[PDB]
Amino acid sequence: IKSALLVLEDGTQFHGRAIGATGSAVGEVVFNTSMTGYQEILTDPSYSRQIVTLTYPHIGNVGTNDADEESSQVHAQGLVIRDLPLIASNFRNTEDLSSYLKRHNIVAIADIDTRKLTRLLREKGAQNGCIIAGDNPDAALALEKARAFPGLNGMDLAKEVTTAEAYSWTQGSWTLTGGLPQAKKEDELPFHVVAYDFGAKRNILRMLVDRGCRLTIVPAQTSAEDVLKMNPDGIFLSNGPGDPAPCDYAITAIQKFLETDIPVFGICLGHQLLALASGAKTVKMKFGHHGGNHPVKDVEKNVVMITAQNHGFAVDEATLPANLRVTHKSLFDGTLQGIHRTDKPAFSFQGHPEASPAAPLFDHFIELIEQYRKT
Amino acid sequence: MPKRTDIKSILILGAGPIVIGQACEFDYSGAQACKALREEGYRVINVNSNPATIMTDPEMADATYIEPIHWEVVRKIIEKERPDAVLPTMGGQTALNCALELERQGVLEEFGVTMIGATADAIDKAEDRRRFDVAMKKIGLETARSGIAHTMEEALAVAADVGFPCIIRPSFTMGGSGGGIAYNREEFEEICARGLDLSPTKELLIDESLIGWKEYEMEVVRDKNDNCIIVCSIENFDAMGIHTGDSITVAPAQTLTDKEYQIMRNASMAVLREIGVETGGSNVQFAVNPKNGRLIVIEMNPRVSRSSALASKATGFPIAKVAAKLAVGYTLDELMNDITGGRTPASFEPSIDYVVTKIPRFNFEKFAGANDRLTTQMKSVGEVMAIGRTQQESLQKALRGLEVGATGFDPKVSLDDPEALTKIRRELKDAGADRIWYIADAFRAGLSVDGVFNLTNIDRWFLVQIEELVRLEEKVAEVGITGLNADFLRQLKRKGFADARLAKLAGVREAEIRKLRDQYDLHPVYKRVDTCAAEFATDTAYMYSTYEEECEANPSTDREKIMVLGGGPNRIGQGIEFDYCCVHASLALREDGYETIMVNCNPETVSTDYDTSDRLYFEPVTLEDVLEIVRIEKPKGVIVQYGGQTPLKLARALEAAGVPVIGTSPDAIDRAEDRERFQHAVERLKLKQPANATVTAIEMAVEKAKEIGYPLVVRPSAMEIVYDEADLRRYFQTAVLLDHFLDDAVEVDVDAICDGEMVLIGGIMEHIEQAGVHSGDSACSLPAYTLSQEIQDVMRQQVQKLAFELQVRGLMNVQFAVKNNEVYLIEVNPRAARTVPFVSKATGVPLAKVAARVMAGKSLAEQGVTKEVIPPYYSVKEVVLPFNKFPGVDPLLGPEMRSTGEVMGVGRTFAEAFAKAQLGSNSTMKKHGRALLSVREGDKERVVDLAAKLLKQGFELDATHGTAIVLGEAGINPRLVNKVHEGRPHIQDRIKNGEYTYIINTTSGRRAIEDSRVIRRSALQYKVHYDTTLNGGFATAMALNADATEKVISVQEMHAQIK
């Protein structure tokens, strides 16, 4: 009997089983509705300081594998699921889930009413909680630590996950046949993009590569000046965790590019920064958007896309500046999903595009980058 | 784009009588399509020869046609209704097939009927196997190495090529009809000959084996704007090599990585784009090599199907409804999501927080000689579904809900049988209907997961789970009831163990486990289905039970509730008919103002459509499960008389437990259901019953048998007719009640209602086939076509006497046999019978709605339904038998029911109704040719007339030895034909060569039967119409004088003729 217990700020207790590391984990608790892709969710920096609850009862049916790691590490504060399968059963699995969580030193709990949880979070919006796995979990302690947690509102999380020193990435997409490809050589990539690592996902990067982009990943705070200095065919503002608001650094920078005719493309957190730098305002969502079945409309084309969402805040459509044209909204809740500068070569998408081998978005970026070099 | 306006009227093509591979799902889908369109202001016209459908209820549509689903007939319908469009994707392959014929006959052109949902070309592109295979390659998706064959020589050449075993799939068929797995040349010629003949396009696709790979399906919907969604993913439990319909399957997929899932999801979409499905749903099937994720596209079905119904139930996303709207120009983004209180659009991909399990239902025990191994051709007769929070929970609930007497993994073999390991092994290697149970036995017998995997190819992910259940069962057995502490019991309940299974384990009574649960306060909670993993609230109460913390039932404290117990999965003898009644009970009482609660777990039914009731509990219909509901709902009344045998059997127990059972008491039900109790009542009532005896021992019987008098009906405590002493014994060996067999008697069914004050005769149906041929397999007429009024009045009176005596409150059914101007009682069924739907359709009175009211307290007088209705037209009911699914079976009628479904024929005369009924039953009868006559002794007299009637109609005759002698003496000289042993050429030869267009063959006597088997089997194999009863043959004769395509009439119109 390896106990575990998760307590919400509100005093709501969930008793179950420990399936990860021994310890405690605290953070904002969210629910993700994805039926597949747990590993990728876990390794997403977007999840920093978050306690992830998965609605799909069986989590771990396929084990884990490096290829399914979206970052160099596990960014989830903790993991809450309903049932941890007896075995992993997939030709690609290299390590069962429990083992993996242990290795990444993650505190996970199993065997609780995830559905009840989810409904809570959905009804009364997000909540900070604490998980305790070990011998005799202390509920009071847990509640304490739960209440004690600062909160993600106004928390710059981007700084905490960004890389230390810039770097190049010339790696493209995975294939069933090829797996993860070898890194491309510089003379192999037409364009040269500079990516602001606001806690970006490996997929996106491979995607840009896929499109001829040789990339230089830079830390969060890097100065436009410093950036502009590399003569970049374009600039890309990756996805990332936390509140965008407090990232004065990047905002400043952004605006700087905005005076330039350089193409700028933002995804998720970067979509919020662009917004900000464009004058608009960001709000923190009741529970957010976490899952992979989210309908998003491209108002311009009147076509719906089924997307992947992993956001805690949003950009207020009321407070938009006229230099900001709405490009996409959420079909689930009307929220703003994308924008473009009426006046500049800059636009962004809230969701998280994915490879077939989004594309429209991505492609645009390129055509934009071309138009720009064709100048 | 919103709704189309160049379309006002739409013709919906129904699926026809229920058969293996094409069942209820289409009444569910069909009703949904009506509902949908009707809600969008279209004028709806539909055709369906099957009366037991909700879809054909007059109140569901504008113009309802219960007529043979023949292109000519439909033509008449088109010509008479002038539909602007035709929706052919909601009626199985019948509908696809018909749409295309219509189109091929230029009927559609001639009348300006536009085909919606799916174009003819798209349908063909998917249904023509060769085209389909060309599309995939065009799209760069992979398929099994294969060849198309139009002939046997071609077939053999493909076979040389792909090797054995190979898979055979005909074009334009489904449910594996006409296909199979060939492990050798012999098998190969047999299946190929069969599919080439069954294929509407006389074409086969022959593939190399992928037996053992994983099997997956995806449900897709795509709008005109090109929006596209996966409604559901399905991972099959049973590997490739066993048809999806005969496999245990789960939603959603379980063992694919996100990456493989996406690749599969991309493929699915591409498949629809290439085929051309632009405004509807489709099911895409794939195969996956567990060793390397290699993906192979198998097929696609451009329409609704058994999986989409399953998928719809599984997710709460009403596939067919949505699709019916896309058909009329709507787009996904424009439609609201049904269960989330219209709060979100239909344009999204569902997500679920539970596991759905579906288990097929078989009826092998009704088919003697039948190959009972699972293969690529469907053999199942129904299915059950279950919802659980875990796969374990999910699976066990399905098991217990299967209606096969299981309580979960009950054992099949004995721990101490030295041969078991060997039986197990067999059962595992070559799956049958019981495999699931054998898997558990294997684990009890000491085989490992890997050992089972290897024999079964079932994913270990699943296997380990069953093994863990077994080990838990074993503990239960060790510790016993005393070890059943709260923690442990709770654990067990969480893995879905049933009180009853636990009870057998602990060697106590199910009721004891139940008590223990009460003590501990260990009861399940109810979750709601919502399509979105609880991301959005739902205002629908579509629920399932589970052992968790939070309960979402939130029962109303508000109204007077009525509970309706469903029948579970369909089975032979327990079909759509019962479900129809259930639905009506619900619709009527809801409309009346009660809160209606429905309890059922059959994924294919309208009963399990959340629209049908106020509350739906998608649960196994068992005592445990029901009681838990009752526990919390505290209903005013519970109806147990409408779902068939299933709820019927729970009756006493429920009441014992204090459930408020309404309508005919459980005791009353018993009086009728128990033979003894029953003979006493008859005795009491001074009625007439055949003589009978209960015999223990043999010699006892032989004696008793002398009293009773042969021939006799030998019903144990599988039926049989014994003619003599020798026979008696003879049976005795192979093999109790004993009943004198009423030879040459007319069989009649009577459906009536009793409110304790009066009795309503719903209908008197006269069977065409005599007593001895199960009512469920007999054709019949309303009104009777030969019985005297005198004698019908006698039955009427007995019905009334019996109704009162037995205390019936609601529906009842009476079965009599008429011989020599004397009425004999065969039995009483104090509940809704399978003829109810037909009777309602034929008389315009919704008996189920009426009896339901009675049951709830509204008398017949209060309701204004007190006079028997005798319609001005004839209504004939004919059946459909599954013998073609089991060639090894002798396609012969008898005292045990084997039919899967039925159709209705409406006519000005008996001849006309019969003719329509026969055509509707897919009879290959022709109005000309050569007829073969080979009848039993007794029939030798009446045959002459039959022979003459055939002669008048322009037929030529053949006959075997004895028959010929008789005909000669009467003056008819048929062409003599050889009995196989007699020489050549003989019957088989002739039947085989196409010499006959009709065959009449009657036989009396186990041994005489076994001999003649060959005629019947060839007739069937060769598609020659055949009658096995003299009455039947006469009826067929009468029908020669009619033209089933001459006139059509809508149900509205029929009803309107009733005064």
Ligand SMILES: Nc1ncnc2c1ncn2[C@@H]1O[C@H](COP(=O)(O)OP(=O)(O)O)[C@@H](O)[C@H]1O
């Ligand atoms: N190459 C193959 N090898 C093994 N089994 C196969 C192969 N192709 C199909 N099957 C099996 O036969 C079934 C029926 O084939 P399918 O193409 O779906 O026919 P239908 O349209 O009649 O359903 C599949 O569900 C699967 O179990």
Ligand SMILES: Nc1ncnc2c1ncn2[C@@H]1O[C@H](COP(=O)(O)OP(=O)(O)O)[C@@H](O)[C@H]1O
């Ligand atoms: N004594 C009998 N004489 C003639 N036919 C009978 C007799 N008993 C039963 N049958 C035949 O057997 C069938 C089944 O008997 P019944 O009691 O109605 O069985 P079930 O319980 O299956 O409905 C009848 O529909 C009828 O054709």
Ligand SMILES: CC[N+](CC)(CC)CC
């Ligand atoms: C599957 C139903 N049928 C083919 C579509 C065969 C009985 C109707 C003729």
Ligand SMILES: NCCC[C@H](N)C(=O)O
């Ligand atoms: N009414 C049941 C079907 C009859 C079949 N033609 C037979 O005579 O056996």
Ligand SMILES: [Cl-]
């Ligand atoms: Cl819990």
Ligand SMILES: [Cl-]
């Ligand atoms: Cl078919």
Ligand SMILES: [Cl-]
């Ligand atoms: Cl392979």
Ligand SMILES: [Cl-]
């Ligand atoms: Cl214990």
Ligand SMILES: [Cl-]
């Ligand atoms: Cl019945």
Ligand SMILES: [Cl-]
């Ligand atoms: Cl068979």
Ligand SMILES: [K+]
């Ligand atoms: K728990």
Ligand SMILES: [K+]
């Ligand atoms: K038209």
Ligand SMILES: [K+]
């Ligand atoms: K097909």
Ligand SMILES: [K+]
């Ligand atoms: K299968």
Ligand SMILES: [K+]
């Ligand atoms: K009969």
Ligand SMILES: [K+]
């Ligand atoms: K009976």
